[PDB]
Design a protein around this nucleic acid. Structure first.
Length: 609
DNA sequence: GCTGATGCGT
DNA sequence: GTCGGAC
DNA sequence: GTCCGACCACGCATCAGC
């Protein structure tokens, strides 16, 4: 009976300890029961095993259901290049739960807001055939394909049909999946670890009578551990080169995991997971390049001239840059017939020959008609090469890939322009980075391969205000019960009014948050003060008496179309907000009068470009 | 047809 | 993107 | 160090309600 399925049992038998007959479809409660045990523990090694147990039974009883439960565990709808967006938010979900039972949208809303989880409302609310993992996944994609008018009403009917067919704790995880907050403590890295362990303990491609169930029986603890970790590296590396489960799982079920690297290989047109960077504390904590504050572009080109542009998250951005598809042969030499460059596109004013900030680049359309309607032109600063003429260059060192790019890449004016241990020299380039409106520290030969599975962020990144609190927001998930965010403001000396500037939801410890919770508890106001102005920011759940001064760090100052801070001092209709805000400390010495004035905020914004 | 609310992605 | 927690 | 889920501002794109 799936009502008592336990994938966290000692000596889990993939065939006996299951809850569905072989050949039959996997019930969603088996998935819901597995999620309930994953969220019940905290150690990832226990989460990976519990999830792996279900994957064993799936890989032995219902093989074709493996891709759905994997995508259902990832809370994804398919490959990232497909772009299947669910298009369901809080309002659609709560309205679907209201029509599912009880009605009273306000009661459904206010309960979930304090709980921080809509799954508890849909579950605790007081005939249909049982739910299937494939069927639930098929309806998730059916919801994502619904577009046009009356699409929301069509989505609600599917969600209503799912909730009425839910049993036990199925309404919890369907509501969390549709809300995009599965909150399971398990994600992409651990899913792969559970998949690699499952196909190794219970190998795929066996007869109806399961021949092998626990292939680690004839090994010792050090052997099984080493054997499982070596096999996980084969899967994780291949996924870093082909992050597409619709392509790995079919191969993984026929050729096995040991032969997976031979079939699923790096190929143009298939986006790969890119190289990330870690935060370097400074020169105290090797090539150095500019960190162009723009958007990453993975330019692919297959055999035949077909060009495809992908983002950092393997999203298809080919249609967003028609100006690049019609300008690729201007940089590749005659020997180039297949290549994958790693470049960071940045907005460029061809007239003034200057780089434009990140805000100007975000004003481009996602589906551009042609270059005749494109106003914001982009410039490409290439920095790495992964593919070249049918040859994968992942295992090659960084110094070798830079030579091939600097040879075959032909720099063109305005578009294609490819981007020592002397401390004073490095400080000049770091200071000239801000000067040229941009540092990146990367290795050359030692540990300088494009292998994301060895280290996800093997690169290094070379890169204050005092505001008052005026409001607070109720937290969600791990912040339920306490305060999740805070509304901050500056003081306008000319008009004597607090002007909201940004929200604050990071930088404080759990102990520091409870200190903020207790210190600002008695300052709860029923109505906002008359000398407080927020413009169009989110109305705080608890209006607080202006008395607490916090020091906040941020990356940049940006013209805010919603915050009233310093409106009229830099733009006639836009205020100023903080980019990447974060709590630093509490200024118990200061009062709201000794705070960063809006006149000072405008001076900070003029200092930066 | 427009607008605000909002979903999604960066 | 930044951040802290748990392991 | 790794992995995860809290959280941020801001842009386009979408669509119900008008």
């Amino acid at each position: 009976d799936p009502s008592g399925y336990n994938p966290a049992k000692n000596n889990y038998h993939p065939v006996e300890d299951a809850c569905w007959k072989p050949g039959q479809k996997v019930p969603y409660l088996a998935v819901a029961r597995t999620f309930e045990k994953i969220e019940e523990v905290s150690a990832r090694l226990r989460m990976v095993e519990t999830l792996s147990n279900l994957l064993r039974s799936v890989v032995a009883l219902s093989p074709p259901d493996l891709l759905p439960v994997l995508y259902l565990s990832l809370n994804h709808l398919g490959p990232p290049q497909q772009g299947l967006a669910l298009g369901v938010g809080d309002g659609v979900l709560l309205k679907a739960v209201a029509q599912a039972t009880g009605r009273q949208l306000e009661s459904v809303r206010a309960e979930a807001a304090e709980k921080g989880d809509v799954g508890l409302v849909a579950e605790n609310s007081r005939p249909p055939p049982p739910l299937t993992a494939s069927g639930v996944f098929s309806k998730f994609r059916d919801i994502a394909r619904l577009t046009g008018s009356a699409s929301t009403a069509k989505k609600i009917d599917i969600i209503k049909g799912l909730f009425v067919a839910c049993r036990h704790s199925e309404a919890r995880f369907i509501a969390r999946s549709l809300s995009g907050r599965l909150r399971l403590g398990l994600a992409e890295q651990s899913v792969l670890a559970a998949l690699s362990q499952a196909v190794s303990l219970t190998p795929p491609g066996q007869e109806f009578p399961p021949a092998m169930v626990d292939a680690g029986k004839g090994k010792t603890a050090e052997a099984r551990k080493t054997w499982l970790e070596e096999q996980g590296m084969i899967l994780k590396q291949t996924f870093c080169e082909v992050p597409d489960l619709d392509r790995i799982i079919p191969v993984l079920l026929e050729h096995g995991l040991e032969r997976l690297p031979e079939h699923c290989k790096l190929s143009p047109g298939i986006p790969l997971k890119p190289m990330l960077a870690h935060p370097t504390r400074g020169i105290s904590e090797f090539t150095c390049e500019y960190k162009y504050d723009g958007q990453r572009a993975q330019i692919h080109a297959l055999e035949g001239g077909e060009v495809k542009i992908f983002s950092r998250n393997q999203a298809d951005n080919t249609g967003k840059y028609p100006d690049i598809i019609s300008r690729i042969p201007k940089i590749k030499l005659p020997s180039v017939t297949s290549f994958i460059l790693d470049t960071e596109a940045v907005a460029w004013d061809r007239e003034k020959k200057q780089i434009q900030p990140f805000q100007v680049l975000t004003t481009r359309k996602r589906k551009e008609v042609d270059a005749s309607e494109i106003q914001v032109q982009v410039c490409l600063y290439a920095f790495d090469l992964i593919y070249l003429n049918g040859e994968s260059l992942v295992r090659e060192p960084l110094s070798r890939r830079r030579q091939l790019l600097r040879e075959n890449f032909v720099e063109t004016e305005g578009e294609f322009v490819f981007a020592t241990k002397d401390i004073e020299q490095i400080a000049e380039f770091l200071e000239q980075s801000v000067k040229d409106s941009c540092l990146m520290v990367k290795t050359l030969d030692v540990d300088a391969t494009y292998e994301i599975a060895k280290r996800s962020h093997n690169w290094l990144k070379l890169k204050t205000l005092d505001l008052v609190v005026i409001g607070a927001y109720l937290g969600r998930g791990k912040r339920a019960g306490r305060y999740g965010g805070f509304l901050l403001a500056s003081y306008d000396e000319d008009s004597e009014e607090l002007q909201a500037i940004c929200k604050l939801g990071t930088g404080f410890s759990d102990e520091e948050l409870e200190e903020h919770h207790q210190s600002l508890k008695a300052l709860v106001l029923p109505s906002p003060r008359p000398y407080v102005r927020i413009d169009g920011a989110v109305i705080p759940d608890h209006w607080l008496d202006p008395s607490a001064v916090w020091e906040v760090k941020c990356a940049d100052l940006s013209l805010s179309p919603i915050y009233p801070a310093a409106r009229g001092l830099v733009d006639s209709d836009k205020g100023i907000s903080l980019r990447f805000p974060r709590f630093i400390r509490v200024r118990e010495d200061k009062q709201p009068e000794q705070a960063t004035t809006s006149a000072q905020v405008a001076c900070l914004y003029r200092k930066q470009s």
